[PDB]
Structures are given as structure tokens and as C-alpha cells.
Amino acid sequence: IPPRIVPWRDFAELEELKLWFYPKSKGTIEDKRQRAVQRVQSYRLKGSQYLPHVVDSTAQITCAVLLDEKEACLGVHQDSIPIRLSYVMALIRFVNGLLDPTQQSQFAIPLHTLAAKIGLPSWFVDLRHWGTHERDLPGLEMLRWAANEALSWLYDHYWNDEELEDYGYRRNDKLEKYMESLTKTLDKWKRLRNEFLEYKWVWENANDSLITSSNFSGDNLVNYSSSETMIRENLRQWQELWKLSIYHNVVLEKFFNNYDPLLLKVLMLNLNNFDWKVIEWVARNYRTQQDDSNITTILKRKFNAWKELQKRLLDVIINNLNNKNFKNKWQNWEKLIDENASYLILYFCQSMLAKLETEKITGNSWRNKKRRKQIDSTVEIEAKLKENIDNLSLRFNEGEIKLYDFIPAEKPVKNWSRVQNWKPKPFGVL
Amino acid sequence: IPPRIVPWRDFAELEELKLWFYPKSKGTIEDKRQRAVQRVQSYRLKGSQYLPHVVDSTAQITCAVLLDEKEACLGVHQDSIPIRLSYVMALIRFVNGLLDPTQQSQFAIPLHTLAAKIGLPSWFVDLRHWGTHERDLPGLEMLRWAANEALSWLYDHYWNDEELEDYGYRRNDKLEKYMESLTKTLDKWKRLRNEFLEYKWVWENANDSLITSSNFSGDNLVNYSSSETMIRENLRQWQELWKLSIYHNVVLEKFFNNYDPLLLKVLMLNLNNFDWKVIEWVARNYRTQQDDSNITTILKRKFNAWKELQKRLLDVIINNLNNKNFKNKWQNWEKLIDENASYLILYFCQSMLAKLETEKITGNSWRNKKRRKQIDSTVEIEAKLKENIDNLSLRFNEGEIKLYDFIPAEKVKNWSRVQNWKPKPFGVL
Amino acid sequence: LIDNITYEGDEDETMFVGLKEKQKLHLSGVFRLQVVKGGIVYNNVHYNASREILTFWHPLSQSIPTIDFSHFAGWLRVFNSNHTGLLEAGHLYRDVNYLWKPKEPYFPLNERTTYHLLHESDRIQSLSVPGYWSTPLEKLYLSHKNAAYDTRIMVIGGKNSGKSTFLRLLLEKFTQDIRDSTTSQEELVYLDLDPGQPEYSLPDSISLNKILSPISLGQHLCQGSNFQTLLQFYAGSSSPQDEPTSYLNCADKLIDHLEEQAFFGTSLLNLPGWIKGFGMQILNHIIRKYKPTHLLFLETANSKRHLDELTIPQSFSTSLRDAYAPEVVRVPAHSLNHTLSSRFHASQLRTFKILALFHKITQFDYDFAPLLKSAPLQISYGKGKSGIKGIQFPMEFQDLNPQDIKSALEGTVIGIYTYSGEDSLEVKSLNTFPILQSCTSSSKNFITLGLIHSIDTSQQIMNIYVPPCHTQILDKQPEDAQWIIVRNKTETPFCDFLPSPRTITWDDNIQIPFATFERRKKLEHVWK
Amino acid sequence: LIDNITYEGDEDETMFVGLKEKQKLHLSGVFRLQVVKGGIVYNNVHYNASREILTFWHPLSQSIPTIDFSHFAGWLRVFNSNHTGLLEAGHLYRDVNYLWKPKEPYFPLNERTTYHLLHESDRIQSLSVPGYWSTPLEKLYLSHKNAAYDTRIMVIGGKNSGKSTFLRLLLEKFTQDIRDSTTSQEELVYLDLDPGQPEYSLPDSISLNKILSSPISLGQHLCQGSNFQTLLQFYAGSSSPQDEPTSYLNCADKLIDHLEEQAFFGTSLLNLPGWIKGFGMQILNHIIRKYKPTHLLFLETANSKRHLDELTIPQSFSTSLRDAYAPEVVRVPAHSLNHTLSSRFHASQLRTFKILALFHKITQFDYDFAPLLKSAPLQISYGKGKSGIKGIQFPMEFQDLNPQDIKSALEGTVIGIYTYSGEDSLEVKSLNTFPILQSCTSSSKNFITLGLIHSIDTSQQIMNIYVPPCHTQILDKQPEDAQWIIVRNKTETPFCDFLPSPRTITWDDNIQIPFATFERRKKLEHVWK
């Protein structure tokens, strides 16, 4: 049973619809089908496809029976020919509608036989070309009788009858065959932790290094590292595991369950777009703790105090971020900053702003003459940050850091703005 | 080319209709489209056996088009599910009619091939399902395009194109053989006139001879005609010729050309419903001379003058008619009496009043007792003739006889019977 | 078989037949028999003759049931039909020229005879009552005398059922038996509730009619004159379907009448067949209503499939308070066995009965002169009104232009009606026409069909033909009583409507309206 | 008949193959080549080996043509396209999983490789280039340089005729010339007015868009190529023009006029919706006289072509322009691909992927396929003023919608953001806090991007919704003043985004889902189809 789309929000809504369509007891002032068809007219709007045939026809018909019910001056042109015309159309549809779908086939039961199977009286199927083929349209009474009869049938078989007859495994398998290769690669990482440190050079500068000596070296130059390649392959399995932006939030859920301070340095350097996914997840995890007392996040399990978090994780990322890498992706960050607002972000931005200045004092390189074009970017970034920093410092004081420790652990609107803090909802209620 | 019934009265009814369907004027007084469908919604009262399809769906479509174009918080705009339905319905009925008549064109054709001959737009065949076999009815706009094109297409194809493509000897044949026999019989009678004049007892007492000696008489008698048999055989052909009431007027015309008062007497005695069939035809031919002054009637030609008419025929008939018989058929005479009125019927009722006032004179026979249920019907009858004499004598006078004589000779009361009728074919009042 | 002697005259060309042993005689068309001796066994039935005549009817479309020789003891006859002109009508209509007689029989035929011998060579069907059909019906005249109550019998089938044959079989037998029983007040009533193949009823009309001597059989195409019509209703179409909702209502009014007279004895009706279709819907309220003590199904392998739900569903046990009874049987046949029309369309036939009435002077006499020649009695519609009170229309045509109305009425069959129980006239006035208002008019009397030749507006008079037979019933009524005319869709005859040379020559000068003689413009073909 | 040179090539799965060999090369997916030496024979076309990278788009649905070698003279080759995302869709979309790679290949699949190698054993069919087509398509080439006038080329086909590939073959052929002609500045503008299986335009939309000479991108990219820039566009809102004929012809008519106003001179290309049998001859017959086509084309052959004949000839005119004074007539074999067209890929299944690729498309070559419901939508407010949103446009039917239930319809419905060029007046009829454009009309409006509504807040009057990420900041770019219109038309929001696969997203078990039901459907509620 994979879910189906249906235009009504709820079953209760459907319950609401049925009662409108057939007023109980009396129809004198509560006919409530002028409104009933007004709604179904919307469901058609959300999609034609989604609406059931029976629902669609129960509105189409009740439309036409309502059309004839006009009895007042000023006298209308109507010749009672459109209305004679309308009643039939619903029926050719409404009756054609049951047989054809699901689906009319090269091998199919003859029409009379099919009508019997559903529960359709075979006096309908006579109907199907009954209007179209015959020279002249039937009289009003014959149609009137049929609608007030058919409608009861719709109520009789679908509205008032419950007969029910008419993903989990294969899509969980690919996810399974991901997590294992993940947990196989992390369990390959720990055994290498020592090796990565000895070889600081291999991970750190992979983007950095333009040229390789072996290619440069001449053939047969003179008579004359499987822990380097073993690192790069483990890293390759990290990039390859990272191409899939779908399970990103589960690579992390496993990473933070096995946090290594050293690892973060490795990941940020050699995994494109890894720097802004972590902090984004650190915020979603952080806020979530704030919103609900109950769900002690992986972050609160890893970290039981704000300070512990700041030195161990929050501070560490800032130190290792490439100034250029952060710049060259600022748009991602502003959204990151824009999307989610919380004190943590303020400390981040301020810390991010601070280091931007200390890379200016350090600025008096030989390469300074070159700098002028790129100066017009760093300032802008500094410029945006001040707007974002000053913003938050009006919403978030240091009074919130106390609302992270105090939780007991478990042992305007502007046009087209990103919505700052979001909890996923299925197209309902934000 | 056998005639076709058509619900409009004339081409000046169907020339006029064409203007209404396609006025070329958008609004108000000039447009006459509400009315135009309100008369093809009339022909439908007579219709629709007579009515062609090509004028039905051009009144079916245009009715739904006036439906969606309602601009005062009404019709199509406030809710538009029906309007979409109407557009499609009258369209399927449109294509199907030309499209599916089939019988007009040979069976088993694929529709497009069927489509090709008449000049149908090809897409129209594609048109037929439109809303029947597709989940959502087509766009309220897409319906609009077809309807306006369709009226245009029908008008170009049917209303103004001139193509006309898309015996009854037997009625002549049946009559001629019959005429040969009326003429064959009449001549035979002339030959038999002496035998008829002589054997008078045979055709006079037709009523009396319930019992015949020949039926009673014994067979192969030890002890032991042409004239009687011939008359009896000839008086059968008359009977057989008189059974076909359609040619009743044909015979009467033929008899008059050959008129003889013996044949008159003869026929008035042995053909049922003959005595009133003549006076009607006479009241007919006498009437049409008065009104129409240029046409010489067979009767006028036969009789130039009144008294000649009066003595020769009117006078002769009155004596002959059987009074006992006359009563039985009287509602006949009544309607005929009412049915046709003229000074000729004035003198008739006065005469046939007098003949029933000489029968009471000689009527004084022995048998008073057995007739006490036979006088009232004679009372009511005479009362009926007196009323009709007075109602006629206030309209008709001796002057008319001069009116008949001076002609040149060429050598609303509820349920009623209209007095004078000239065959009019469901028109002209 | 060598032919028995025939003696001409005195009148009627009566012909006497001797057949060796017991043999099947063949007759087509009218004739009246008075068999002195022996027992006649048509359809395995007994008819003793003791100076008592019996008129026969022998139409072509049906199979003609031959006449058997039964004992005892045998070995005027072949009497000509009483009616003067009914045969004569063939000229006005000439798809009916062979209803009574075949085109080339093995006989020099004659104008004088109203009957015709059909000796094998001709090939017309003679098929005798199938014994399969016999035990189902044999079981019914045994229920007649021992029922101890009037028995309601219902027969139902689709067209081609041969249903007409079944009820005819029952009627002649129930008819013979009633005569024998003394003293029987049980005059069976035939309740014709099918417009489509009307029997004993005006065409496209519903008639409840009593079936009283003298003896007539079997099929007369409604000219039989063996019935008296107590009351009748105008359906206005050749299908219940055009107005099913009204028709059951019209019928519903009719059946209740039987309790209005509170009648008791045998009764029979044929429902509109409706074997497959709305008929399943149609039947289940009158099975509910008629309290049918005997249903009858003939579909068999017809197929008999369509009528599955109804027999049990509408049974509601026994509707009648006293009868409290049920019955469920099937007999399967198609008859006549040869093709059902026998080259005779019901719609081609349906037109004959219309034409045949409009020329009926009296039951025994027919004149086939086109009605145009005859004077048509005149009715003046009243605003006030005198005579016509209002003109009544089917529901659909309730919005009509005033001008076109005169055109619509003329040359179209209409059914005459009387107000009966007093009511407000309740009619809107259009163009000097008192159109009926709101339709309705629930209580009314149907007297006769009417055809309109002309309408004169200024006069307010209305030139209308009626079949002179009922004249003077229209005349024999209070003048004051209000009259309503209902223009339902009953088809006017073409042969009559605009006549022919030979038929009539008219006048050269005159123009005939509603007729065009130009060959049709292409695409002008009617959808049929 | 032996594989060669599957070099590991570090990151990016870079690979090598040899020009010299006499067997045609095959491949499936998104790769990009620079030849070292030796010419290439793709679709009977020549590109030299001198160090210019050419991307190659090989979606599965279209037939895949081999790569041909030729002189002179040989014997980074084949390396991955720079897309993080595009290949990964399947996890989001089950149907499109095998689009770039066949399900069982008889080659060793590699997760890190964009491009797969296919050799006979695999099912996929290479039509390559029909010989019959070439004489017409070839001879069109002889008329580009020669004409000395802007050449307007139209192609009309029933869907499945093969028009989309005839155009790219023209498109590929023409582009090669533009790079090599000095100075040829006449970049062709594709004029894609077919929303049925649109190529080069936004879902259920219409576009006139320029085509860039370099760097090369071929052949079919499912509209994901970086090689075209949208100049102007319009949104029909329907699978076919027929649903809204009135606008499309008008919608198109405004398209061509733009061409005049910018006063282009040079090549132009168009494919109409084929509309072979139907209303199409009249509908086409309107813009044939407008587009002033130099070379109208036909492909049906034994199409059968019967329906698509008479209307055009009446439609055909002596000239569409003073200088032109001409018309051309041709008919062609219409069948490609030879194998059955769906190839497991009905158009109706592919179209919903294009809607998906946009919303999840982060950048020109980077796609993130996480279910949208994780991404946070941007928010603008429909309002009494309103300032962000003033009225929402509904097609003519649906006019009578009652106010209360207006909100429910909007949520979860794909919509097309429109910008109003300066307007005489706002034309708002409002029910229950939504301003609705009562009389429609509103011809002024402009098309920036589609959006899909996440939810709407009656009280705040704010309207949370998603927009494809690439489009920001273009929404950001438009001045604050400019009016915003939300147009509702029948486009299909993909199911896959609407309720994410349970594994894909974790929701609190309790939370109600507004628009779905998991009860088995009682007989018999089914979508008629």
C-alpha cells in the first residue's frame, strides 16, 4: 500500500462532501450541492488526474440536475435544449467512465458483461451511445429519472459501500548497501588515523598541487608509498560516498556518532561542499534541541555543554576553513546564514569576521600588488557579515547558551526570502 | 423526384432562416438568433422526421452558443460545467449526423473515407470522442473555436453550396384499366336497355325478393332465362365498380356524360350510398358554377337551364328515393345537408318534405299497431327538415336560379361540419 | 386437395368447402363462418356450430392459423367480410396492398372476395400453435373456473416475442368458455398497456377495454369490433421511453379504474415488452401494481438474459390483498417462426391503423377516399373559452415563438380531450391560442384522435378532421364542456397528407405549403 | 573486438581510447572529449582532434549514435562531465534510474563513472544517421553560407516523427560552421514552441532561445545543457497547445515579434507541435504565414502523412517578407529511432523528470536530489496590497471557485511566477484574503521561473513556496516595486517530491499528512484514463 494523492486534505473532508451531495432527511434549504460542486470544481484544479472518476461524475451530474432547477423571471432564453443536452453528457461520461479505466484493453469483456461485474444495471450500458447515436435527444423526464436514479446508484455503490478490493524493501536495500560500505570505510579510517598524521602532506594540499614529478622525470633517468595510495583510496571512497546529496544527512549522523577531531580536518579539505553541510547540520541539530525539550540530539549526546561544543567542534571548523574556499562559496553561506538564525550562527559569523581581519594584518606579502581586484571581494564579504552579525545580536544574546546546558541529557516579509528556521512539513501547515 | 415534406412552408421561410442564424450583426435589434432557434425548436414539434440534420445541429450548436454568452450574472460564467457539456453534446450530434448516418452513404466505410466525400474537415472525425472517451472535457475555449467554425463550415458547405445530388405510372396505370371497364360496362348497358326496360320486375324488387324460387325448387325433376341472368351479371359489375369509393367521383362524371334517367333509377335502387352520392356531386357541381364564373361544369353542360335541371334530374331523383331507406341513412343527408348548402338544397328539402307529406296521406293502411315505434323518427326527421328549410330560406332566394340560368354555355358552433369545402391541402385555411 | 364447389351470390360470394377427412384449410383476409356440423379445431380448439356465425380475420404479417376438421359429425360458409371498403384502402396506402392478399396467389383472384385460398404454393406461413406453447396455456383455462376469484394474467416479452399471439390464444379460449358457463358475468377485460403494437387501442394510445358474442378471430389490426372501450388514454408516442415517467402514471390511472368499478373476474394485459433496457426499470412498478396472479415469460434462448432481476425483485410476494399469490414460468419461442415481419414492418403497419381509422365510417364500413376530399368538422377555439379551452404540449416545447404556433399545429395528428372534473382553465394566451399553462391538467378525458387541416386565427375556428365513426360522440356532448387538445408526437400519414394525381388532381394554380419538390441539397439528409 | 585503455585516471574516472581503430566507438551518458589527434565521425560530422573538449549527451531514451573515426590523422579522450548530481536521480526517482546506464550491462559497472561503454550485447540501439534523411538535411547545409539572407527553417512533425533529432542534426551541423566562419555572429536561435516534449524550454513552457557556438554540447541534453540562453519565454500551462489554443498562437505570435525588435539577421530554427491529424493544420496555418519560413519540412513519408497535406498548401503563401519572395517544399522518411520509440521511456514518464531536474538543480552543472521537503522554501507574501503578490490567475474554467476552499487547492500545486511589466492598473478580485484576477486578460505579464507552493498562511498573508535554486537571485534581481503574479495552470507536480519515500525522509510518526490517504481504495474509485 503505497500512498495515493487525493485532493481532499482528510477523510473527514470526504465525510463532509458525501453529506453535502446527498442532503439527509430534507433538501429544502440545506441542499448544499451548489457548494458541493463548487469544491469538487477545485479538486479538479489541483489536478484532473488525482480526482476519482466517481467523485468527478457525482459533481458533473449534480451540476446538470441543478441546471434545470431555475424557475424565475426574468424569463430566460433557454430552450430546454442545452439542459436536455447536458444531462446526457454526464451519463455518457459517467457510464463510459466506469468501464474504460484500469483499463480498457485489447482483450476485454464485452460492454454488457462488464456492466454486470461492477454492479452496474445493464440498463445503463444501453445509455452509452443512447444519446449520441440517436437522431434526436430524449425528453426531459427520461433524463431526469435517470440522474435521480443513477445518483442513488453512485451513493449505493461507492458513497455508501466499503468494498476495498479494487518501496520498503528494495529502496531500503540500496540504502542498506550504502550504510555498510560507509561503516566499512570508517572502520577503514580508524586503522589509518596514525598514517594520516605522518602523511599530513597527502590530504591537506590535494587541490593545491599542480604538477607531479613522476611525469616530469625523464625515462630511464638513473639506476634506482602504499601507505600514501592506501590513504588516497580511503579518501576516494569518501568522495564517492559523498557524490550522493540525498543521504548527506546520514553520512553525518554516522560521522557525529563517531567524532574524530582529526577527521574533520581531512573531510573539509578533500570533500567538496563538506564545510557548509556540517555547520548546517550542526544548526539543525542545535535548534532542534531548543524547540523540543524531549529529543536530546546526537549533538547533545556527543556534547553535553555549550563550552564543550565550542572548543571541540565549533571552534575547530573555523580555524581550518580556507579563506578563499569560504569566499568562493559565499552564496551558499548567506543562504546557510540566511536560512537558519540562532546564536551559534552569530558566534560563527563573528569568529568568521575576526579571522578575516587577522589575514589582513598578515597581508603584507610580496604578492600585494596583485591583490587589488580581490580586495573588492573580501570587503564585500566583511560588509555582508556586519549586516548579518548586527542583525542577530538584536535577537540572540548570550542568554541562550544557558538554554543549551540546562536541558538535561538522556543517558517584511521581504520578497522571496529564505525562511530562516525550517522543520520539514508535507505541504501542510508550513 | 417524389415530394418531400418540409416543416417550413416555403423557401421564403428557409431563406429567412439563413439570415437569422448568421446575421453578421453582433447585438440587439439586428440579431435574430434567440428567435431563430425558437422556430427550429418549433419544427421539432412537427419534427423531427421531416427536419434535415443539417438544420438541427445548426440550431443545436447555436442554442448552446447563446448559452455561454450570457453577460448578466447568469448562465455560463458563474458556473461552467454545463456550458462545456452543451458545446460538446450538440457537436457529437453534429458530426454523427452527417458523420454517422452511414445509410445515406454505403456501410462499412472508415469514417475519414466517409469523411472525405462530403467535405468534412478531417479533424472533425477526430472530433467525435471529444468528451466521451477522455478524462476531462475539452477547454471552454477549444469548444468555442469549433462552434464558430462549425456554423461557418455548415454555412459554407450546406446553406450556400448548390449541389442537389445527395415514375408513378401505376397510379395512372390502375385507373386506365378501370376506366376501360366503366366504359366497357356502360356500353353493355346501352345494349341491354330494351331488356332492362322489359324485365323491370328484376331490378325494382331487389329489396323484396329475400326468398327465391330457384333456391327452393327441386332438382332433376321429371316433368320439366337469358334475359334475367344478363342483367344480374351486369348489375354486378356496377356493384363491383361502386365498391371502390375512391373512384366514386370518376364514375359519376362518366355516368353524367352518358346520363340516362333509367340508369339513374336503376343505380339508385341497387347501389348502397348512391342516392346521396349523386346529390353531393350535384351540390358540388351546382356550387362551383356560382362561385367560379369561367368553368363549365359537366352538369351545367348537361343542363343549360334551371327547370331543365329541375325536371330532368332534381325532380326525377325525389320521386325515386325510397322513403323507408332514406331514414336509415339520414345523418348522411344531414351532414350532406349541412355539409353543402345552396338553393338546390333549398328546393330539395322542401321537395323531400312534401314527399314525406304525401306518404302520411296514402299511409292510412290497416297496420297502425306495428308502427308505434316508427312515427317519432319520422316526427324528428320532419322537424329537422323544417329548421333547415327556414335556415336556408333566409340566405337563398329565387334570384339564384336566374343566376344559374344566366351563366354562359360553352358549346363556428363547437363541433360542426363545415358547410362548403374545396379540397385544400392543409393550407389556405 | 381437389377444391370443394363454390357458388356465386346471392351476395358475398359465399363459398362452401368439403375437405377429405380432417384437413388444414387456408384463408387470408376476412370471412365469417357458420359451421352447421362437425367440430372446428383451429389451434387445437373446439368450436361447435349450431346456426351461430363467427367472423375470422387473417392478416398476412402474422402466420395464418389453418382450420382443422374435428368431430362430430362432418363430411353458409366462406361468407364474405361485412365491411364495405377496408380492403379498398390499399390504394391510398400501397405498402399495405398485400396485407389481406398476396401479389400472385395460385388463383385468378377477385375484387368481390374478402377471403383468399392459399394452397401451399404461395409459401405463406401457417404454423400451428406449438405444443411447447400449449401446456403453459392449457394450464391457464383450468385456473379460470377454480380460481374462485378473478385472475389477473400478465404476459411480457420484447418485440418479436410473439406475445401478441399468446394473448390472442388465451382470448379466443377464455372467450369460448365464458359463453358455455351459465350464467357468467365474468367478462374478461383486455388491458392494452402497450402503445407500440397497439391492439384494441388507438395508435400510440392506451386503452382499457371490455371484451364482451358475436365471435371474432384472430387478428384484426384493430378493426375487429369485438371490444367496447370503457376508458382510454393517449400516450403520444410509439415508445414508453419518450415519456416513461408519464406513461406509468397514465397506466397507473387506468388499472385503479378496475377497482373503481371494483371488477371481479378474468383480466389480461400485455406490458410494453422492454426485454432488455429501461424496461427492467419499467416493469417493476406494475408487477408491483397489477397484482399479477400469473406472469408469463417467453424469452427462452432469445436470449432471455435481460430479464433476470425483475421476476423476483418486483414480486413483493402478492400485492393484492385477497389474491396473495405468485407465479414464475418461462416458455421460449420466436413466432412467427419465419422472419417476424413476413415482409411487413411494424412501423410500416403502424401507419395503416392511423390511416384506417381516419376513414372508418362505422365498424363494418370503411371508405378510403383521401380525407382531403371530405369536409372536416370545424372547432372554434375560445379565449373565453368556447370549445377549445387550451392546447397542451409535451414538456420540452414549453417555450415557443407566438408566430410559429399556427404553422406547428396544422397537418399534425392531435388527440381530443375534455376537462371532466372542474378546474381553473389555467392557460396562458399566445397569439390568440389558449396554450396550456404549467402543463399539469391531471384529470382529463380522452375521447378521440383529431387531425388538423387548417386553423383560421381571426375566426378562431380550427378545421380539424376526426374519423366520422365517433361522430356524433363529439357532437353528443355538452357544448359548454371545455376541450383540451394535446399535440403529442403521433405521426401523420404521408400518403394522406399530400395526395397524388389519380388520388386527386388539385388545381394548377395552388401552391401546397410544407412541401418542397426540389431535389435535396447535399447534406440535407435526415439523421435516422 | 577487445576492450582497451580503461585507465583509472585518479579522481573523475578519466579514460582513454584510440582514434586509429576501425570499430566505431560507443558510450552512454554524460562525457566530454578532447581528441589528441585524428578526426571524429559523429552523425556523419567532422570535428578535429586539436584539444577542444566537446561534451556528449547520451540520454537513453533517444537512439544513441556511435562515434566515428576519420583522417587526419591519429593512431583528454573520454572523461566525466562535471556534474555531481545528475546521475544520482534514481534514488529520488525510480523510473529514470536506467536513463544514463542500462540496467544489466555486461560491462563492469562503475559507480564513479558518468559514461558507460556499450557493445552490441547490450540492448541499446544506435540509429546513427539515416541515409534517406541526409539528402534533404545535407542540402540544407549548402544553403546556410550561400543564401546571404537570414534563413528561417521550420520543421513540423507528429510526435515520434523524429523532428527533434532532425533539428539537432541541423543544429549540430550549423554550429560547426559558426565556429569556423569569420566573422559569423549569426548565432541561431532555436524557437522551441512545442510544450509536448519540449527541448530547450521550461516545463509546459515555450521559448525562443539563442544557441551558443562554444564550447560544444551534443546531442540531446533533456534541456539540461549549458549551451543555450533564454531570451524570452511563455508558459502555456498544458501538455498540449490545444488546451489553451488562444494564448499559444498569441503566446507564439508575441515570440516572433521579439525577433524583429532585436532585429536579428541570420539563422533561426523551429519545431512546431506536430499536430499531424487534428486541429493542427489551422493552428500551424497561422504562424507559417507569420514565421516567414524559408524551408518548411515534412517527415511523415508513410506516416501516414495523409492528414498533414492540404491545410498547409492553403497555409502556404508566396512570401513572408519583401526580400525573401519564396517558399520551399519537402517530404522525408519520418522514422527514427527504428526500434520502438519509448524504449522503456514513454514521453509522459520523461516529462515529469524535467520538472524534477529543475527544482533539484543547484547550478549549471551541479544537482542535489534530496527530496525538496528537506530544502527550505523561500517566502513571499500574498497580500491585501499585496506587495509581494497581487492576484493569482486561474484559467477561465474554475472561475466560480468558492472562497473558503481556495487555500487547499493552491498548496502542492506547481505555479509559474510572472512579473508584470509596467501596468496601467491592478485588476484584483479577492476572496477570503487571496486576490484573484477575475477577468483574466492581463497580457502584460512576464515569465521568470516556475514555483511549487509548500503552504499558504491566510492570517499573516505569507506564502511559503519553493523555487528552483538556480533561478535565485533572478527573483532577487527584480526591483521590489514590481508586481508579482502567480499563474495556476495544469502542470504536474511530481509525486516523488510530494510525499517523500519513507526511507528518504523521516517524519514524526504522529504528524498528519494533508493530501494523501493510505486506505485501500473502495471499488471503484479510479482515475479515468
Residue numbers in the entry:
A (entry chain C): 2 to 167, 180 to 237, 248 to 434, 484 to 502
B (entry chain D): 2 to 167, 180 to 237, 248 to 434, 485 to 502
C (entry chain B): 65 to 139, 165 to 301, 303 to 618
D (entry chain A): 65 to 139, 165 to 618
Reproduce passages from the article.
A HEPN (higher eukaryote and prokaryote nucleotide binding) nuclease Las1 and a polynucleotide kinase Grc3 assemble into a tetramerase responsible for rRNA maturation. Las1 and Grc3 are highly conserved proteins and have recently been identified as core enzymes involved in processing and removing ITS2 spacer, which is a key step in the synthesis of 60S ribosomal subunit. Recent studies have demonstrated that Las1 is an endoribonuclease that contains a HEPN (higher eukaryote and prokaryote nucleotide binding) domain responsible for rRNA processing. Grc3 is a polynucleotide kinase responsible not only for Las1 nuclease activation, but also for nonspecific phosphorylation of the 5′-OH of the 26S pre-rRNA produced by Las1 cleavage, providing a signal for further processing by Rat1-Rai1 exonuclease.
To elucidate how Las1 and Grc3 cooperate to direct ITS2 cleavage and phosphorylation, we determined the cryo-EM and crystal structures of full-length ScLas1-Grc3 complex at 3.07 Å and 3.69 Å resolution, respectively. Since the crystal structures have similar quality and resolve more structural information than the cryo-EM structures, the subsequent presentations and descriptions are based more on the crystal structures. The ScLas1-Grc3 tetramer structure shows that two Grc3 GCT are stabilized by two HEPN domains of Las1. Each Grc3 GCT binds to a groove in each Las1 HEPN domain and extends to the ribonuclease active center, which is formed by the two HEPN domains via dimerization. Both the crystal and cryo-EM structures show that the conserved catalytic residues Arg129, His130, His134 with two copies from two HEPN domains form a symmetric catalytic active pocket. Specifically, the side chain of Trp617 within Grc3 GCT inserts into the active pocket and forms packing and hydrogen bond with catalytic residue His134. Moreover, Trp617 and His615 in Grc3 form extensive hydrogen bond with residues Arg136, Leu99, Gly98, and His54 within Las1. Our crystal and cryo-EM structures exhibit that the Las1 LCT is located in a groove in the CTD domain of Grc3. The side chains of Trp488, Trp494, and Phe499 of Las1 LCT are inserted into the three hydrophobic core regions of Grc3 CTD and form stable hydrophobic interactions with multiple hydrophobic residues of Grc3. Notably, compared with CjGrc3-bound CjLas1, ScGrc3-bound ScLas1 has a more compact catalytic pocket, which may explain why ScLas1 shows better ITS2 cleavage activity than CjLas1 in the presence of Grc3.
